[PDB]
Amino acid sequence: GSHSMRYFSTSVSRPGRGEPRFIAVGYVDDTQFVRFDSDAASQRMEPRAPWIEQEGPEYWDEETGKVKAHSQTDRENLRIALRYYNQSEAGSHTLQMMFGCDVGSDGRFLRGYHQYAYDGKDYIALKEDLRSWTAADMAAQITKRKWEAAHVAEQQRAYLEGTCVDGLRRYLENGKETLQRTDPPKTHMTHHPISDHEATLRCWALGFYPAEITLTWQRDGEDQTQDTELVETRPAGDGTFQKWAAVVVPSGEEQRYTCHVQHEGLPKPLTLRW
């Protein structure tokens, strides 16, 4: 199926506590493979997946330089942002960045991303056509004009459709026996009386990969959306993921409710009934 490479970086200013903290991580699909941390001693891009170890010293040299360079420019961008928003240098602020590309089954390019967020909200982003920018506000528009003048978009576009998809293609091959993997969820149901006339039905999905999944409750064959509780998908820590959906039901009416599970690793969607 399709695949993605993504880089996430977070810069956090610490007034009266030294330089801003910079943390970058790299993902192929739902598997992390590298990290960088400006507060760590190594001061290098570190491997966080087995299949990336097989990269030579050059790779680690190049990647380390790029991510270190980026930390310094986002460091400065935090300064520049204070100016644009007329904010004091006594407060702490955040600069987030996502970058990456998507490829189909045939390894062909599908989509590219280059996005920034200041204090948790959109700042500037490269549109889907990778030709123009989306400025979120008055401040980001200043940057947008700069990036237009400096032709940043054409540079990033080429990199996304080229270097990125080529890098993604290589990573997949190297992480073949691990990234082409598709683990179906093990499902089960729990049941607990909330009181003398009500019980909780909780639908479980465990040990699946990738993380993408859909858990749905129906009552008498009809989606029971509003009344449901649905937790965020969570990492088990072993490379697989977990999730559950719960409904509060009248005691003795358990059989009316059905849980429906959709996942890439499943031949057909599952149905669970207590």
Binding site: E63, K66, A69, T143, K146, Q155, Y159, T163
Partner: peptide, 10 residues
């Protein structure tokens, strides 16, 4: 491969 971020000046 980490992007080239030189021109990402705000």
């Amino acid at each position: 491969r980490y992007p080239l971020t030189f021109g990402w000046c705000f």
